Amino acid sequence: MSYAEQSLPAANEAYVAAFGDKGSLPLPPGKRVAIVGCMDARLDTFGATGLHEGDAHHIRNAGGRASDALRSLVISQELLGTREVIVIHHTDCGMLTFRSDQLHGLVKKRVAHEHFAAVDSLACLEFPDVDESIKEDVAFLKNHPLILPETVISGYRYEVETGKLVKIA
Amino acid sequence: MSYAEQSLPAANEAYVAAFGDKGSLPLPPGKRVAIVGCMDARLDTFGATGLHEGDAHHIRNAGGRASDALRSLVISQELLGTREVIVIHHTDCGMLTFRSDQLHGLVKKRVAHEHFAAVDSLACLEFPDVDESIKEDVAFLKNHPLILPETVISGYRYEVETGKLVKIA
Questions:
Q1: Which residues 84-143 in chain A show a CB within 8 A of chain B?
Q2: Residues of A in contact with B117 (CB under 8 A)
Q3: What are phi and psi of B34, to 5 degrees?
Q4: 3-state secondary structure of A41
Q5: Which of A39, A42, A86 is nearest residue B54 as measured by Cβ atoms?
Q6: Where are the beta strands (DSSP E) in B70-129?
Q7: Can you state the angle between helices A66-79 and B66-80, rounded to 10 degrees?
Q8: DSSP conformation letters of A36-65
Q9: How many other CB atoms are there within 10 angstroms of residue B112's CB atom?
Q10: For residues A23 and B165, what is the distance between their CA atoms, to the nearest angstrom?
Q11: What single DSSP character describes residue A89?
């Protein structure tokens, strides 16, 4: 049926049984960090980077794209933490494999004509190169006037093969 | 200076040293699950819910809002086979504490007039109630024509006090 019904109830029971003192961590992130990472199932933005409960904000979307993450970032900065952004794109990203029009035409084949207008309004934010997408996203944020001027910003290629985060910008 | 320079290099070294057979997990998520969770630092969408590398997509934004997550979801479903969505909003969410106009006026106080237009274009997606925001996000996705009709969809309140995920819809 679902992961939610079958596996989750015991898995959380365990997480709760292991929950220790985490009950009393407050809202603003301790390390003043916002992670911007792709949503790829193989990446855990906690463990891959030594971050534990309460340390950093975890913003994740298809591709790990800054533009998409910007609203979350503005909130993370201006309301909470955070004067650090770490960008993580990864290797074998699903966003290397397609173009927005291809996706449009696909979803079009699986939904009524009355929703074609809707599909056609999604910028997917695909990229042809993992590292250039990192460079581009870092730069973007480094100049985005809605991001604070003192923000430290860096970008890493997560390698799904090694598990290594490799400094790109 | 930064978490990236000081603490990350050894933390990943460790994650890599512990990186067992995870090197060879492929792209499509194993459990066919997309998590939609708030970006709150105290929530780990892996451990809080027995999910490990390769199992599920992790889509995270300020509030854990579906509308914002929709583009990622369309990609997760149509490109990478996922017929489950679990929504997680949490308790002590930063999105309970403000309204979009308040945030606009704030960021306005910290940036040149020439960018007021930009600030003013952000719908922050605040909510007054944690559970209603879950109900609302679940329902929304349950009727969104761009989400596949067979998708199992559920919504949970993560409690930052207990660590418990509590079925809301």
A1: 84, 86, 92, 94-95, 97-98, 103, 106-107, 110-112, 115, 118-119, 122-125
A2: none
A3: -120, 120
A4: coil
A5: A42
A6: 84-90
A7: 150
A8: EEE--TT--TTGGGT--TTSEEEEEEGGG-
A9: 8
A10: 13
A11: E
Greatest pairwise CA separation for chain B in angstroms: 53
Q: What are phi and psi of A130, to 5 degrees?
A: -70, -45
Chain A residues 5-44 within an 8 A CB cutoff of chain B: 7-8, 10-12, 14-16, 19, 22-27, 29-31, 33-34, 39-44
Q: Report the CATH number of the B1-169 domain.
A: 3.40.1050.10
**Do A139 and A169 form a contact (C-beta atoms < 8 A)?**
yes
Yes or no, beta carbons of A8 and B60 under 8 Å apart: no
| Contact between chains at B84 and A4 (C-beta distance less than 8 A) | yes
Which two tokens mark A132? 């250039």
Residue in chain A closest to B39 (alpha carbons) equals A58
Kindly state whether B166 is in contact with chain A, defined as any CB-CB distance less than 8 angstroms: no
Nearest to B3 among A31, A54, A118 (CB): A31
Please answer yes or no on whether A107 and B4 come within 8 Å at the CB atom: no
CA dihedral B88, B51, A165, A89 (to 10 degrees): -50
> In this structure, are residues A68 and A138 in contact, taking their beta carbons and an 8 Å threshold?
no
Question: What is the DSSP-derived secondary structure letter of residue A49?
Answer: G
SS3 percent helix, strand, coil of chain A, rounded to 5, is: 45, 15, 40
> Token pair of B13, please?
């070294």
Which experimental method was this entry solved with? Answer: X-ray
Q: Give the distance from CA B7 to its chain's centroid.
A: 25
For residue A118, what is the nearest residue in chain B, using CA coordinates?
B146
Domain ranges for chain B: 1-169
Which residue in the block uniquely carries the two structure tokens 């997408």?
A: A133
Q: Which amino acid is at B128?
A: P
- Is the alpha carbon torsion for B31, B35, A22, A68 positive or negative? positive
Q: Which of A144, A122, A45, A58 is nearest to A90 (CA)?
A: A45
